[PDB]
RNA sequence: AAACUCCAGUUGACACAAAAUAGACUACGAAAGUGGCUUUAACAUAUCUGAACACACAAUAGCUAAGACCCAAACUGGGAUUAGAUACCCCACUAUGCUUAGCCCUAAACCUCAACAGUUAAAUCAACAAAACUGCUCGCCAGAACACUACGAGCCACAGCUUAAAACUCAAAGGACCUGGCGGUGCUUCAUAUCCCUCUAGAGGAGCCUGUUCUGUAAUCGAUAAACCCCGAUCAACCUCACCACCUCUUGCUCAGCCUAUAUACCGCCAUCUUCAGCAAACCCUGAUGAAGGCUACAAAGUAAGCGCAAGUACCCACGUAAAGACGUUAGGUCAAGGUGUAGCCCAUGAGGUGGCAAGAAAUGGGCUACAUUUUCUACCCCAGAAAACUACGAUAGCCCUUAUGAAACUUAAGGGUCGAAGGUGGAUUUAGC
């Protein structure tokens, strides 16, 4: 079982109260959505997900609360149109809970293809066939050139060995099609000496497969999570009430940066991890930020309790960024 | 600028860092189609001029 | 931002902290060190050398105890930046820097030059540093690494200091210098249809033509980043043809033949920098006759020749445009122009006949025609009349029918008829032109 990550913080943060309408742009399993419909019995809630399996769960769970929860299906970009059909263009949503990442059910079910450990079709697509033409991870690896595929790994996977892990994929695909998760994992391992398979470690300091950065990289290029995250936040702002509390959850750095640089106005094209020294050097050259539209409830990113991390290691990297619209 | 007459006075491609559009265009075309060695030290290179 | 707001400014009072200028001086001391003022004491030796351990010292940091505390400041806390943590930045503050009394005994404690005496003549001298040496004495060294380590021993030192190995391992390690490459290297001047902006017309969007890719097919090959992509072709209905299927021939058009492999064996002919100005010899001289170097015009070691540039020539000039453009670079292109080295086939990888492929789910390059009013049609070749939005502009496309060529034409070309589509001047990007 997967407990909703930081459910206690997200509930306190949004303080759901009677007379307030809320949105959920990532229903998924619905653990967070259900934790929010428990504290306040008079709450109004809206749900959304990219997975039709997740949208069916919400529809089945809608029986528990007939109108307090309203289920919707679609991507972040398509969310505004879907909600615009309802007619809530101003929205006046008190809070938008934009949980991020892959659902526990999505990656616990081997058929969905998200787990390298198990053997499933190399789908790695949050979409559940709602768009049967949407390329899957298998398609991405078999088509793109080394330079193109290396960029996917480098930019989205934070993978130093992008050229080494991409060349192995290019050679492997020629010999046979890459259609299964384990088939890819073995190819990526084959780019390195056999001992490399578990040399790398996580921040938890527990050995991880040497292809855990290629499964994350493709997952984010197949589902365009990063570009869809920028529109998703923007749409929330337009549909978010003034004085309404937004709450995001970033499990990896790339998504965390966008949430940080969006709630603070920082340009998305600035250099990453800028030090104070570099900031001085940057502006010294020019010598020769706009008003913020948010009020961060908690100034610094929250993180899961160390005890809770061991119980749910999947959510160890959950960085909660809360803000109030201005 | 003081002399001048002003008249009567009243994307995501860079965000990710990859050409996500161009990458997904090549995949669509694919979907349609289907559906070291030793080097000798130069000073030690052997010559036969003296033997000739 | 935080912090402060008994804050900040003026004025006055006020140090156990630190000592502008002088100091561009180069002094004192054994070294370490010593640069505000005064006073006291005071800077060993009438031959030199003489210690890891004796004797006495020894920056900074640090230890123990007691004081001082302006300012600085490891650490720590807060703020900020950061995906986040630490650091870099900001604020506050501590050990510590100070005094006293004990320790600790280290430094790139380095003029990286042991002390003393002597010489400037020999050879000046591997190199660099810092001109080259002689006598004499003490200390020290004997491949790299292991190793400022282990053990032993001594020490007020207890995560310490001093002295200091061996085994296993290697064929180098190392010093100086030269060249090249490279620098998130300095400065300087640059590109002239160009690196960017600026100027004009385009490409990228539409249709069509054409190449390529992919897919398809029993059914060629080669080119394929710049430097491939209307390229070998100044050109494929048969032929061409090298491909596929079937059939046929065997000293075969040839004193046979092979478009069989290898352009990474080559000649031949070229691409490319080149919208370059350099390349290769023969000598001479400098550096001690080292790797190397060789220019000063009021000239200081360079020079008599070759190739390219240049000149000259072609076109309408002496301008411009052609042509030319070395060596070298990319084992660049071409064995399928022809020839040919090497390897392979010889009833077959050779030769001949018949028929056939040469398509489009698509993607992409180049071009053509357009989207119209500076336009469309007609007359005229520039003083006109009409057209001008769903019967306008717009196909060189589709379909149908003629004609031309041919033995052969749904197929190639031209013409006519019919049809009247997308397109409404095209994002990122990009081509050409003085
Ligand atoms: N661009 C997007 N638009 C909509 N839903 C998305 C999305 N990207 C991811 N998602 C979905 O959002 C969920 C995030 S992970 C699951 C979190 C959820 N609150 C839970 O019940 O666990 C997944 O269901 C995922 O498929
Ligand atoms: K002074
Ligand atoms: K001075
Ligand atoms: K020194
Ligand atoms: K150099
Ligand atoms: K155009
Ligand atoms: K050649
Ligand atoms: K040939
Ligand atoms: K040959
Ligand atoms: K074109
Ligand atoms: Mg403040
Ligand atoms: Mg003496
Ligand atoms: Mg001794
Ligand atoms: Mg001594
Ligand atoms: Mg000593
Ligand atoms: Mg001392
Ligand atoms: Mg002290
Ligand atoms: Mg202070
Ligand atoms: Mg103090
Ligand atoms: Mg003092
Ligand atoms: Mg000193
Ligand atoms: Mg001595
Ligand atoms: Mg000399
Ligand atoms: Mg030795
Ligand atoms: Mg030491
Ligand atoms: Mg020791
Ligand atoms: Mg000992
Ligand atoms: Mg076009
Ligand atoms: Mg071809
Ligand atoms: Mg080829
Ligand atoms: Mg070739
Ligand atoms: Mg090339
Ligand atoms: Mg024939
Ligand atoms: Mg033919
Ligand atoms: Mg043949
Ligand atoms: Mg060649
Ligand atoms: Mg002439
Ligand atoms: Mg001329
Ligand atoms: Mg020419
Ligand atoms: Mg010439
Ligand atoms: Mg070659
Ligand atoms: Mg031949
Ligand atoms: Mg044959
Ligand atoms: Mg018309
Ligand atoms: Mg026609
Ligand atoms: Mg005829």
Coordinates of C-alpha atoms (C1' of nucleotides) in Angstrom, one line a residue, chain C residues 28-379:
Chain C
rC28 C1' 68.9 45.8 13.3
rG29 C1' 69.0 40.7 15.1
rA30 C1' 71.8 33.9 15.4
rA31 C1' 67.4 32.6 13.0
rA32 C1' 62.4 33.2 14.1
rG33 C1' 61.6 38.1 13.7
rU34 C1' 61.8 43.7 14.3
rG35 C1' 59.0 50.1 11.2
rG36 C1' 54.2 55.2 17.2
rC37 C1' 57.1 58.0 21.7
rU38 C1' 60.5 58.1 26.0
rU39 C1' 64.1 56.3 29.3
rU40 C1' 66.9 52.1 31.6
rA41 C1' 69.6 47.8 30.6
rA42 C1' 71.9 46.1 26.2
rC43 C1' 73.5 43.6 21.0
rA44 C1' 79.3 36.7 22.7
rU45 C1' 84.4 35.6 20.7
rA46 C1' 92.0 39.1 18.7
rU47 C1' 92.3 32.0 14.0
rC48 C1' 88.5 29.1 11.7
rU49 C1' 85.3 24.6 11.5
rG50 C1' 82.5 22.0 15.1
rA51 C1' 75.6 18.4 17.2
rA52 C1' 68.1 15.5 14.7
rC53 C1' 69.6 14.0 20.3
rA54 C1' 74.0 18.3 24.7
rC55 C1' 72.8 23.8 25.7
rA56 C1' 69.6 27.9 24.5
rC57 C1' 66.2 29.8 21.0
rA58 C1' 62.4 29.2 17.3
rA59 C1' 56.4 32.7 12.7
rU60 C1' 51.5 31.1 12.5
rA61 C1' 48.2 27.7 14.5
rG62 C1' 47.3 25.0 19.2
rC63 C1' 47.1 23.4 24.7
rU64 C1' 46.5 24.9 30.4
rA65 C1' 45.3 28.9 33.9
rA66 C1' 43.9 33.9 35.0
rG67 C1' 42.6 38.6 32.9
rA68 C1' 41.3 42.4 28.9
rC69 C1' 38.0 42.8 24.8
rC70 C1' 37.7 48.1 20.1
rC71 C1' 38.1 45.4 15.8
rA72 C1' 38.9 40.9 13.2
rA73 C1' 37.4 35.9 13.2
rA74 C1' 37.6 29.2 12.6
rC75 C1' 32.9 27.4 14.6
rU76 C1' 27.8 28.2 15.4
rG77 C1' 22.8 30.6 14.6
rG78 C1' 19.8 33.6 11.4
rG79 C1' 19.0 35.9 6.2
rA80 C1' 19.9 35.2 1.1
rU81 C1' 21.3 32.4 -3.4
rU82 C1' 20.4 27.3 -4.5
rA83 C1' 16.2 21.6 -7.1
rG84 C1' 18.2 21.2 -2.0
rA85 C1' 22.6 20.9 1.7
rU86 C1' 27.7 23.1 2.5
rA87 C1' 30.5 27.0 0.4
rC88 C1' 30.9 31.9 -2.1
rC89 C1' 27.5 37.2 -0.2
rC90 C1' 24.8 39.7 4.3
rC91 C1' 23.9 40.0 10.0
rA92 C1' 25.0 38.4 15.0
rC93 C1' 28.4 36.0 17.9
rU94 C1' 32.5 32.3 20.0
rA95 C1' 37.4 29.7 20.3
rU96 C1' 41.4 32.5 18.7
rG97 C1' 44.5 37.0 17.5
rC98 C1' 46.1 40.7 23.1
rU99 C1' 48.2 40.5 28.5
rU100 C1' 50.3 37.3 32.3
rA101 C1' 52.3 32.3 33.8
rG102 C1' 53.4 27.6 31.8
rC103 C1' 53.6 24.4 27.7
rC104 C1' 53.7 22.7 22.4
rC105 C1' 58.5 22.8 19.0
rU106 C1' 56.0 22.9 13.5
rA107 C1' 56.4 26.2 8.1
rA108 C1' 57.3 26.9 0.7
rA109 C1' 61.1 28.2 9.1
rC110 C1' 63.2 29.6 1.2
rC111 C1' 68.4 34.2 -0.9
rU112 C1' 64.9 26.8 -2.1
rC113 C1' 72.7 29.7 -2.3
rA114 C1' 76.1 25.1 4.5
rA115 C1' 80.6 27.8 7.6
rC116 C1' 85.4 29.9 6.8
rA117 C1' 89.3 31.6 3.4
rG118 C1' 90.8 32.8 -1.5
rU119 C1' 90.7 33.9 -7.0
rU120 C1' 88.8 36.6 -11.6
rA121 C1' 93.4 33.6 -14.9
rA122 C1' 92.3 29.4 -17.2
rA123 C1' 87.6 25.9 -20.2
rU124 C1' 83.0 31.0 -19.2
rC125 C1' 79.4 27.5 -18.9
rA126 C1' 74.8 20.6 -19.8
rA127 C1' 70.0 23.6 -19.0
rC128 C1' 67.5 27.2 -16.0
rA129 C1' 68.2 29.9 -11.6
rA130 C1' 71.8 33.5 -9.1
rA131 C1' 79.0 35.0 -13.5
rA132 C1' 82.7 30.6 -13.0
rC133 C1' 85.8 28.4 -9.7
rU134 C1' 89.8 26.9 -5.7
rG135 C1' 91.3 25.5 -0.5
rC136 C1' 89.3 23.6 4.0
rU137 C1' 85.7 21.7 7.4
rC138 C1' 81.1 19.8 9.2
rG139 C1' 76.2 18.1 7.8
rC140 C1' 73.7 15.2 4.2
rC141 C1' 72.7 12.0 -0.4
rA142 C1' 73.0 7.0 -3.5
rG143 C1' 66.2 4.6 -8.8
rA144 C1' 60.8 5.3 -8.2
rA145 C1' 56.9 4.3 -4.9
rC146 C1' 55.6 2.1 -0.3
rA147 C1' 57.0 6.7 3.3
rC148 C1' 56.2 13.7 6.8
rU149 C1' 54.2 5.6 7.0
rA150 C1' 55.0 0.8 10.4
rC151 C1' 57.8 -0.8 14.7
rG152 C1' 61.3 0.8 18.5
rA153 C1' 63.0 4.8 21.4
rG154 C1' 62.6 9.8 23.6
rC155 C1' 59.6 13.9 24.7
rC156 C1' 54.9 18.5 30.0
rA157 C1' 53.6 16.6 23.5
rC158 C1' 48.0 11.6 24.2
rA159 C1' 43.8 12.4 16.8
rG160 C1' 51.1 15.1 18.7
rC161 C1' 56.5 15.9 17.5
rU162 C1' 61.5 14.0 16.5
rU163 C1' 64.4 9.9 14.5
rA164 C1' 62.9 6.4 10.7
rA165 C1' 62.5 1.0 8.0
rA166 C1' 61.0 -3.5 5.4
rA167 C1' 57.9 -6.8 2.4
rC168 C1' 55.0 -6.9 -1.9
rU169 C1' 55.3 -3.6 -6.9
rC170 C1' 57.5 -1.2 -11.1
rA171 C1' 61.3 0.2 -15.8
rA172 C1' 61.1 3.9 -15.2
rA173 C1' 60.6 8.1 -11.5
rG174 C1' 62.8 12.9 -11.9
rG175 C1' 65.3 18.0 -13.4
rA176 C1' 65.8 21.8 -17.2
rC177 C1' 64.5 23.4 -21.9
rC178 C1' 62.2 23.2 -27.2
rU179 C1' 58.0 22.3 -30.3
rG180 C1' 53.0 21.3 -30.9
rG181 C1' 48.2 21.2 -29.1
rC182 C1' 45.0 23.5 -25.9
rG183 C1' 43.4 27.7 -22.4
rG184 C1' 35.5 28.9 -19.2
rU185 C1' 43.9 32.8 -21.9
rG186 C1' 45.8 38.7 -22.4
rC187 C1' 45.8 42.6 -25.7
rU188 C1' 45.2 44.4 -30.7
rU189 C1' 43.2 44.7 -35.5
rC190 C1' 39.8 42.2 -38.3
rA191 C1' 36.0 39.6 -42.2
rU192 C1' 33.0 43.8 -47.2
rA193 C1' 27.6 40.4 -50.2
rU194 C1' 30.4 39.5 -44.6
rC195 C1' 30.5 36.9 -38.1
rC196 C1' 26.1 40.3 -36.3
rC197 C1' 22.9 44.5 -37.5
rU198 C1' 21.7 47.4 -41.9
rC199 C1' 19.9 46.8 -48.1
rU200 C1' 17.0 43.9 -52.2
rA201 C1' 14.7 39.5 -53.8
rG202 C1' 13.8 34.7 -52.1
rA203 C1' 13.5 29.6 -49.4
rG204 C1' 10.6 27.6 -45.0
rG205 C1' 3.3 27.6 -45.8
rA206 C1' 0.0 25.9 -51.1
rG207 C1' -0.2 23.0 -55.8
rC208 C1' 2.9 21.0 -59.2
rC209 C1' 7.9 19.4 -61.2
rU210 C1' 12.2 16.9 -59.8
rG211 C1' 16.2 14.5 -56.5
rU212 C1' 16.8 11.8 -52.1
rU213 C1' 15.2 9.0 -47.9
rC214 C1' 11.9 5.6 -46.1
rU215 C1' 8.4 1.9 -47.3
rG216 C1' 7.0 -1.4 -51.2
rU217 C1' 8.7 -4.8 -55.1
rA218 C1' 10.9 -11.2 -57.8
rA219 C1' 13.6 -6.7 -59.6
rU220 C1' 20.3 -2.4 -60.2
rC221 C1' 24.7 0.6 -58.9
rG222 C1' 27.3 5.0 -57.4
rA223 C1' 27.1 10.3 -54.8
rU224 C1' 25.1 10.9 -49.8
rA225 C1' 28.0 17.3 -43.2
rA226 C1' 30.5 21.4 -45.0
rA227 C1' 32.7 19.4 -50.1
rC228 C1' 25.4 14.4 -51.6
rC229 C1' 20.4 15.4 -52.7
rC230 C1' 17.7 18.2 -61.8
rC231 C1' 24.6 14.6 -58.3
rG232 C1' 27.5 10.4 -62.7
rA233 C1' 22.5 11.6 -66.6
rU234 C1' 24.2 18.1 -72.0
rC235 C1' 18.7 12.9 -69.5
rA236 C1' 15.8 5.4 -68.5
rA237 C1' 8.6 3.6 -72.9
rC238 C1' 12.0 -1.0 -76.1
rC239 C1' 17.1 0.0 -76.6
rU240 C1' 20.1 2.4 -73.1
rC241 C1' 20.8 -1.8 -68.6
rA242 C1' 24.7 -2.9 -65.4
rC243 C1' 18.6 -5.3 -62.3
rC244 C1' 14.5 -9.6 -61.7
rA245 C1' 11.9 -14.2 -63.7
rC246 C1' 12.1 -17.8 -67.4
rC247 C1' 14.6 -20.1 -71.4
rU248 C1' 19.1 -20.9 -74.2
rC249 C1' 24.6 -21.1 -75.6
rU250 C1' 29.9 -23.1 -74.0
rU251 C1' 37.3 -22.0 -77.2
rG252 C1' 32.4 -18.2 -76.6
rC253 C1' 32.5 -10.2 -81.2
rU254 C1' 38.2 -10.9 -79.2
rC255 C1' 45.4 -15.4 -79.5
rA256 C1' 38.2 -15.4 -74.8
rG257 C1' 35.1 -13.1 -71.3
rC258 C1' 33.7 -10.9 -66.1
rC259 C1' 29.6 -3.5 -64.6
rU260 C1' 33.1 -9.9 -59.8
rA261 C1' 35.5 -7.9 -54.5
rU262 C1' 39.1 -4.1 -53.1
rA263 C1' 38.9 3.9 -54.7
rU264 C1' 42.0 1.3 -47.7
rA265 C1' 46.8 -1.1 -54.1
rC266 C1' 46.4 2.6 -58.3
rC267 C1' 46.7 5.6 -63.1
rG268 C1' 43.2 8.8 -65.2
rC269 C1' 39.8 13.1 -64.0
rC270 C1' 38.3 15.9 -59.8
rA271 C1' 35.9 18.0 -54.8
rU272 C1' 37.8 20.7 -50.6
rC273 C1' 40.3 24.7 -47.6
rU274 C1' 41.5 28.3 -52.2
rU275 C1' 36.5 34.2 -51.4
rC276 C1' 44.3 30.9 -49.4
rA277 C1' 50.1 32.5 -50.1
rG278 C1' 52.7 29.5 -49.3
rC279 C1' 55.8 24.8 -50.7
rA280 C1' 60.2 22.1 -51.8
rA281 C1' 65.6 22.2 -52.8
rA282 C1' 70.9 23.9 -52.9
rC283 C1' 74.2 26.8 -49.7
rC284 C1' 75.7 30.1 -45.9
rC285 C1' 75.8 31.8 -40.7
rU286 C1' 74.3 31.8 -35.0
rG287 C1' 73.5 28.8 -30.6
rA288 C1' 80.4 25.9 -27.3
rU289 C1' 78.6 22.4 -33.9
rG290 C1' 72.0 20.6 -28.1
rA291 C1' 66.5 20.2 -29.4
rA292 C1' 66.7 24.9 -32.4
rG293 C1' 67.3 29.9 -34.9
rG294 C1' 68.5 33.3 -39.0
rC295 C1' 64.8 40.5 -39.0
rU296 C1' 65.9 45.9 -38.0
rA297 C1' 66.7 50.2 -44.8
rC298 C1' 70.2 56.2 -40.8
rA299 C1' 69.5 48.0 -41.7
rA300 C1' 72.3 43.9 -36.9
rA301 C1' 73.2 37.0 -41.5
rG302 C1' 71.2 35.5 -44.8
rU303 C1' 71.4 34.2 -50.2
rA304 C1' 72.1 32.7 -56.1
rA305 C1' 67.7 29.4 -58.4
rG306 C1' 62.5 26.3 -58.8
rC307 C1' 56.8 25.9 -58.0
rG308 C1' 52.4 28.8 -56.7
rC309 C1' 50.8 33.8 -56.1
rA310 C1' 52.2 38.0 -59.3
rA311 C1' 53.0 39.2 -64.3
rG312 C1' 51.1 37.9 -69.0
rU313 C1' 47.0 36.0 -71.9
rA314 C1' 41.1 35.4 -73.4
rC315 C1' 36.6 38.4 -73.3
rC316 C1' 34.8 45.0 -74.5
rC317 C1' 40.4 48.6 -71.8
rA318 C1' 45.2 49.1 -68.0
rC319 C1' 38.7 47.9 -65.1
rG320 C1' 35.8 43.6 -64.4
rU321 C1' 34.8 38.7 -65.5
rA322 C1' 37.0 34.3 -66.8
rA323 C1' 41.1 31.3 -66.6
rA324 C1' 44.8 30.2 -63.2
rG325 C1' 45.6 28.7 -58.2
rA326 C1' 51.6 25.2 -55.7
rC327 C1' 52.7 21.9 -51.5
rG328 C1' 49.5 19.8 -48.1
rU329 C1' 44.6 18.5 -45.6
rU330 C1' 39.9 15.0 -45.7
rA331 C1' 43.3 6.7 -46.9
rG332 C1' 37.5 12.9 -49.7
rG333 C1' 34.9 11.0 -54.9
rU334 C1' 35.2 7.6 -58.9
rC335 C1' 37.6 -0.3 -60.2
rA336 C1' 30.3 1.2 -63.2
rA337 C1' 34.4 6.3 -68.5
rG338 C1' 38.5 3.7 -69.9
rG339 C1' 43.0 1.2 -68.1
rU340 C1' 45.0 -1.5 -64.3
rG341 C1' 47.8 -4.2 -59.3
rU342 C1' 46.0 -8.0 -56.1
rA343 C1' 42.2 -11.7 -55.0
rG344 C1' 38.0 -14.5 -57.2
rC345 C1' 34.4 -17.0 -61.5
rC346 C1' 35.5 -20.1 -66.3
rC347 C1' 28.6 -25.3 -67.8
rA348 C1' 29.3 -19.3 -65.3
rU349 C1' 30.1 -14.4 -61.0
rG350 C1' 30.7 -15.2 -68.8
rA351 C1' 27.4 -14.6 -73.4
rG352 C1' 22.3 -14.2 -75.8
rG353 C1' 16.8 -14.0 -76.2
rU354 C1' 11.7 -13.0 -74.2
rG355 C1' 8.8 -10.4 -70.8
rG356 C1' 9.0 -7.3 -66.4
rC357 C1' 10.1 -3.8 -62.2
rA358 C1' 11.1 1.3 -62.0
rA359 C1' 5.3 2.3 -57.1
rG360 C1' 3.7 5.8 -52.8
rA361 C1' 1.7 5.4 -46.1
rA362 C1' 4.9 9.1 -46.1
rA363 C1' 9.4 12.6 -44.8
rU364 C1' 12.8 15.9 -46.9
rG365 C1' 16.2 19.0 -50.7
rG366 C1' 16.1 22.0 -55.0
rG367 C1' 13.1 24.2 -58.6
rC368 C1' 8.4 25.9 -61.2
rU369 C1' 3.8 28.4 -60.9
rA370 C1' 0.8 31.2 -57.8
rC371 C1' -1.8 33.7 -54.0
rA372 C1' -3.3 39.1 -57.7
rU373 C1' -4.7 45.8 -58.7
rU374 C1' 2.9 47.8 -59.8
rU375 C1' -2.7 42.7 -61.0
rU376 C1' -6.0 39.7 -65.1
rC377 C1' -7.7 39.6 -70.7
rU378 C1' -7.4 41.9 -75.5
rA379 C1' -5.2 45.4 -79.1

